[PDB]
Design an enzyme around this catalytic site. Structure first.
Site, PDB file in Angstrom:
ATOM      1  N   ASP D  60       0.791  -1.207   0.000  1.00 41.11           N
ATOM      2  CA  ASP D  60       0.000   0.000   0.000  1.00 41.11           C
ATOM      3  C   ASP D  60       0.824   1.256   0.000  1.00 41.11           C
ATOM      4  O   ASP D  60       1.523   1.548   0.950  1.00 41.11           O
ATOM      5  N   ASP D  66       2.850   6.992   4.967  1.00 41.47           N
ATOM      6  CA  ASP D  66       2.753   7.252   6.402  1.00 41.47           C
ATOM      7  C   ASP D  66       4.008   6.789   7.134  1.00 41.47           C
ATOM      8  O   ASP D  66       4.524   7.487   8.021  1.00 41.47           O
ATOM      9  CB  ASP D  66       1.531   6.535   6.974  1.00 41.47           C
ATOM     10  N   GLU D  89       1.810   8.705  16.501  1.00 37.17           N
ATOM     11  CA  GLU D  89       0.612   7.944  16.153  1.00 37.17           C
ATOM     12  C   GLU D  89       0.957   6.600  15.524  1.00 37.17           C
ATOM     13  O   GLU D  89       0.180   5.639  15.630  1.00 37.17           O
ATOM     14  CB  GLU D  89      -0.248   8.768  15.189  1.00 37.17           C
ATOM     15  N   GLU D  90       2.108   6.508  14.861  1.00 39.02           N
ATOM     16  CA  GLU D  90       2.463   5.310  14.112  1.00 39.02           C
ATOM     17  C   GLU D  90       3.118   4.234  14.960  1.00 39.02           C
ATOM     18  O   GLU D  90       3.292   3.110  14.469  1.00 39.02           O
ATOM     19  CB  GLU D  90       3.411   5.651  12.955  1.00 39.02           C
ATOM     20  N   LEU D 112       1.656  11.701   9.485  1.00 35.88           N
ATOM     21  CA  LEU D 112       0.797  11.810   8.315  1.00 35.88           C
ATOM     22  C   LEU D 112      -0.441  10.984   8.596  1.00 35.88           C
ATOM     23  O   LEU D 112      -0.382  10.002   9.344  1.00 35.88           O
ATOM     24  CB  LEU D 112       1.485  11.309   7.035  1.00 35.88           C
ATOM     25  N   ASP D 113      -1.545  11.383   7.989  1.00 39.74           N
ATOM     26  CA  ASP D 113      -2.846  10.760   8.196  1.00 39.74           C
ATOM     27  C   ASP D 113      -3.397  10.178   6.894  1.00 39.74           C
ATOM     28  O   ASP D 113      -4.607  10.169   6.668  1.00 39.74           O
ATOM     29  CB  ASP D 113      -3.834  11.759   8.810  1.00 39.74           C
ATOM     30  N   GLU D 272      -3.232  14.784  18.402  1.00 39.64           N
ATOM     31  CA  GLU D 272      -4.283  15.357  17.562  1.00 39.64           C
ATOM     32  C   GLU D 272      -4.994  16.472  18.324  1.00 39.64           C
ATOM     33  O   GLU D 272      -4.931  17.644  17.936  1.00 39.64           O
ATOM     34  CB  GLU D 272      -5.291  14.283  17.109  1.00 39.64           C
TER      35      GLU D 272
HETATM   36 MG   LIG Z   1      -0.893   8.748  11.121  1.00 34.50          MG
END
Ligand SMILES: [Mg+2]
Ligand SMILES: Nc1ncnc2c1ncn2[C@@H]1O[C@H](COP(=O)(O)O)[C@@H](O)[C@H]1O
Ligand SMILES: Nc1ncnc2c1ncn2[C@@H]1O[C@H](COP(=O)(O)O)[C@@H](O)[C@H]1O
Ligand SMILES: Nc1ncnc2c1ncn2[C@@H]1O[C@H](COP(=O)(O)O)[C@@H](O)[C@H]1O
Ligand SMILES: Nc1ncnc2c1ncn2[C@@H]1O[C@H](COP(=O)(O)O)[C@@H](O)[C@H]1O
Ligand SMILES: O=C1NS(=O)(=O)c2ccccc21
Ligand SMILES: *C(=O)NCc1ccccc1
Ligand SMILES: [Mg+2]
EC number: 3.1.3.11
Lengths: 326, 320, 322, 327
Positions: D60, D66, D89-90, D112-113, D272
């Site tokens: 992907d 990301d 977040e990762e 990154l989202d 966030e």
């Molecule tokens: Mg993310």
């Protein structure tokens, strides 16, 4: 009206009533040149130096630029479906295009001349395009045509900016790459070289081995017998940069034969012939000393040829000195 | 570990315990160089040729970029450029302590042939308590705090010399970042390339004539040197740094004091060379020891690998 | 084999055995789109803010219009150009006239390019049908007559979507080399999606059919999973998401926009053509968008488009309130 | 005068009489953001699709981007010598910087989202919040469990039609536009303040069946104003940076609120909600969970969720009026 390389090539193909095959070849070459330029200017070098850590360097990123450049031109030409025989400085034997992707054109090219680039000297890509003449299965023999058989030739110079010079029967046209949009913009149309220049270009470090005609010609440039101003000297040591300066400013460029190098140094098929064709189409000359470069009939795809090219009055003056010593 | 010009300069400024003023100068210069590079590579040229249905010359734009970025750094007080007859005195509200002499786009007369071009700079600290003036730029190159150049060649590289040595940064145009690629560089002790315009052969001093004869016909029967002369000083000097060898612009008839300018061509390159373990001479003395009297004065220069410059000087001393 | 937009367009034109005129048009449009993308990403903005010394959304919209207009005129392939930016149709000068009529929206910045999220270019290409002197009437063809249509999305990356009789193909702009790379071939939309896209701020002004349909997406009567909602407010962004993930996009007439809000010639028809070529649907409620016969170059139309099962479901609700 | 992010950050660090450590952190983050933007805009994608005779369109590409973005932020921050604990977040666990590279700062970020946002082609973004380590204990995840009130700096990068970096500190909120021709963030909006009241609301109304009754009523009032004022418009990109940036620039309200099925909301507090709440408050806006200010929540888990309703103060206060009505 603005003009791009893509629009210019397409329109010349329409005027020629072609089938679109040569146009697709040239489109593919233009794309390859833009990819070479981006790499030469070191886009992505931060990844090679670890900006994302050690695990984020690809396979293309680690190849030397001359290898990547060969891969780019080879792949783009093969996938154009317009070529059958490809000759590159990189490979000893001509590449025979797989039957499913065969067109009628033979391309001889130097994918990144001057790369021998650590000093950030200008480098370039040189190309010459022939139509296959044989009815036989395509082979290395189809690249053994004299340069006068060329359909198109030219070079890309990756210098202070990137320029593609394209020579065909319609003349010589110069296109500047605008990296903001990845378009080659037509900036100089139907260009012609000065009748006589004021610059001479050759490696004088090897003066000990010069042919006596070369020695005398260069002495004429530095100590003119008519008390005119001496010529200036320029020698980048990268042929595309030296030849392009010769085209734009006029003058003479020499990589001549001598006793140690009877056939010169530069390669006939993908260095001398394309530059000779550009020069002749711009109203200049290109000689081995004994004949026009474009009249040599090659027997070896990597054979060397001497070359003296540039403004016609300058090349003619050299030939007069050459004939005196012959 | 990866390093950038921004991070490198900042860290050297922290080690120096400075006030951040010279760091702001160098950041501003880095930004100017990226803007010059973008213009030199002809970004936006499509608009000049009518893509939207309908600009300054590059050397003028380059001067404007360096001038404005340096003024707005609040780090400078006197700016000397090849473009301007007189030194530019920074207005009081934007004044810092540094004097900058620079060549904003060296080699641009031949720009038409897409020859390599470059930006050259030398930075001094002002000595006086006096009001800044043109005389503040009349310092010998020995007083340089930092010097270097940006070469817009096949790729764009910034070479920065300071007390800590010489460091080379490659501009990655994908991210507009100078990446440190060669640290604490030193030039080869002796090279195999010589670089000068041999079209002036008829006007050469006997010492230059003899030295060049030595390169073509070596007295120890070593192999002759190769010759390279791009005709753009930043290109020729950078090749000299990378591969070793020698670069000469001696005096001749149209140029009896040399052709190249002491303050913003000769001195920065001499400083880079000496910090890399090379040499730079006028023939009579070190370039960096010349005390200038005119911000646009010229000087002869012979620079490069130390064994090559010393060999030139040996020949020079035989004739003087 | 890698494929570029330039190579792809040229080969389709060779297969079509055309004269190269439409190929020159598409090449010129591709160049204009790369120039718009560069400006949209703010290349050179430092010069606007004084990097070289002392000496806007509407302006970017105007620049984008100028780029498309000039690249199309100089293609020698067009005769009539209708742009969202220009009140009247532009008639190409006689010496540069070709056979094609182009309707386009060069950029949709005026609105929200101040929030930076997404802008785009929309285009539809017709052959001139009448032999009269060229006029705005040559742009008043139903969308069924389109020869090519598509859009460029200047989003996280720049993508060009091109629909012709051969289907729908998506190309990603590689800014390192200024090439559109073919990344999705002969694209087809999902038969049914799980996303609905419309401005629910108009809820008070919706007709009962739209109100009921949206209620079914939030409160499914079969108590299946509710649809997710997304609405960028930029047609290219919202339609492209509909193409990529499936679902439904609605900009119906409401009481304050009784003929609809979007413009038929250069918003609804190009997107309807992309949708139909991708196996989707595009309706005004009463008829297919592509069947509307325009009378005015800037006329508005309601539009409901996307996955066929979703558009058909809306249409059954529509007929119930008919 | 023209101002760049590099010059701006350096000068604010000079005024602060700091040691240069936070400046090096911010320089390093700016470089990472430029590298993320280049990858997000798909520079070099031609090589992935075989331009040089080698393809590799596997897995992907959205997930890989990301991960690459995480690698860029992680490596640039580690090599800044300014950080000691990094929460992404990762990554499941907090990353503890190796001892030789440890500085004082703790950074929480979403690099990154792309994988979380269906509109990944429309817009993606990077979110960050920077803290000072508060204890001399050996560094651990607990150094990242500070309330948002403790932030030293926070902000985001929006990779939209153009790339913009928004940086909030005690001096206020400043917005910088990336000029890709030169790799410079140009200061384009200084000391920005949000409108007191807006005309746009932003939330996923597909969750309507699960809405808290207060959210249902508040949104009903935006669509059918009891005083027959003009209804608000609706926008929802589904990428937090895009929706929050629009809220900052145009005013209005953004909601990802709690409900019975999600009593702590959906978005994550550390990387966030807190950075966006800090940008909002420094711009004169508000950011609430419904029950308290986002910035006053004391976290206990580095990945814990928090509800968030933020934006123009009159709009957030009106939401809280409706929220109170149902409490
Ligand atoms: Mg993310
Ligand atoms: N784009 C072009 N520019 C100039 N000449 C062309 C072009 N395309 C075709 N020709 C000429 O027409 C011949 C046949 O073209 P083709 O059918 O494409 O191989 C070529 O060998 C050229 O002589
Ligand atoms: N970034 C830097 N790199 C190297 N040396 C520096 C730097 N900043 C300051 N210095 C040294 O410290 C002195 C005073 O710095 P400043 O207070 O910034 O003028 C300079 O003149 C240099 O000698
Ligand atoms: N590049 C192309 N791609 C797809 N179809 C094309 C292309 N060029 C021409 N055609 C088709 O052939 C017709 C005539 O082309 P032309 O002679 O260029 O106007 C067009 O109206 C299209 O139906
Ligand atoms: N570049 C900067 N911009 C704003 N504030 C700063 C900056 N650098 C330092 N500070 C402030 O000064 C403190 C100490 O900085 P440092 O010594 O670099 O850790 C920081 O925690 C900030 O409160
Ligand atoms: O250049 C700009 N284009 S924009 O409208 O998105 C914008 C908003 C704010 C500041 C500068 C700019
Ligand atoms: C992901 O980066 N792009 C896929 C996508 C996202 C939104 C709309 C269309 C396509
Ligand atoms: Mg518009």
């Amino acid at each position: 009206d603005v003009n791009t390389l893509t629009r210019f090539v397409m329109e010349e193909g329409r005027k020629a009533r072609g089938t679109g095959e040569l146009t697709q070849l040239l489109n593919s070459l233009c794309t390859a040149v833009k990819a070479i330029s981006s790499a030469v200017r070191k886009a992505g070098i931060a990844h090679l130096y670890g900006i994302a850590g050690s695990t984020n360097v690809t396979g293309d990123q680690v190849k030397k630029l001359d290898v990547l450049s060969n891969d780019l031109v080879m792949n783009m030409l093969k996938s154009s479906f317009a070529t059958c025989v490809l000759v590159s400085e990189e490979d000893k034997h001509a590449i025979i295009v797989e039957p499913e992707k065969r067109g009628k054109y033979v391309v001889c090219f130097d994918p990144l001349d001057g790369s021998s680039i650590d000093c950030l000297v200008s480098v370039g890509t040189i190309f010459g395009i022939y139509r296959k003449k044989s009815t036989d299965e395509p082979s290395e023999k189809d690249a053994l045509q004299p340069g006068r058989n060329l359909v198109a030739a030219g070079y890309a110079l990756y210098g202070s900016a990137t320029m593609l010079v394209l020579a065909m029967d319609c003349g010589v046209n110069c296109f500047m790459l605008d990296p903001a949009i990845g378009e080659f913009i037509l900036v100089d149309k139907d260009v012609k070289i000065k009748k006589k220049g004021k610059i001479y270009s050759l490696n004088e470090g090897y003066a000990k081995d010069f042919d006596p005609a070369v020695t005398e010609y260069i002495q004429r440039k530095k100590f003119p017998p008519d008390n005119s101003a001496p010529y200036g000297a320029r020698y980048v040591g990268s042929m595309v940069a030296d030849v392009h300066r010769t085209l734009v400013y006029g003058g003479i460029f020499l990589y001549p034969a001598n006793k140690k190098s009877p056939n010169g140094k530069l390669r006939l098929l993908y260095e001398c012939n394309p530059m000779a064709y550009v020069m002749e189409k711009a109203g200049g000359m290109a000689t081995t000393g004994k004949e026009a470069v474009l009249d040599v009939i090659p027997t070896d795809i990597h054979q060397r040829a001497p070359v003296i090219l540039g403004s016609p009055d300058d090349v003619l003056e050299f030939l007069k000195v050459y004939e005196k010593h012959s």
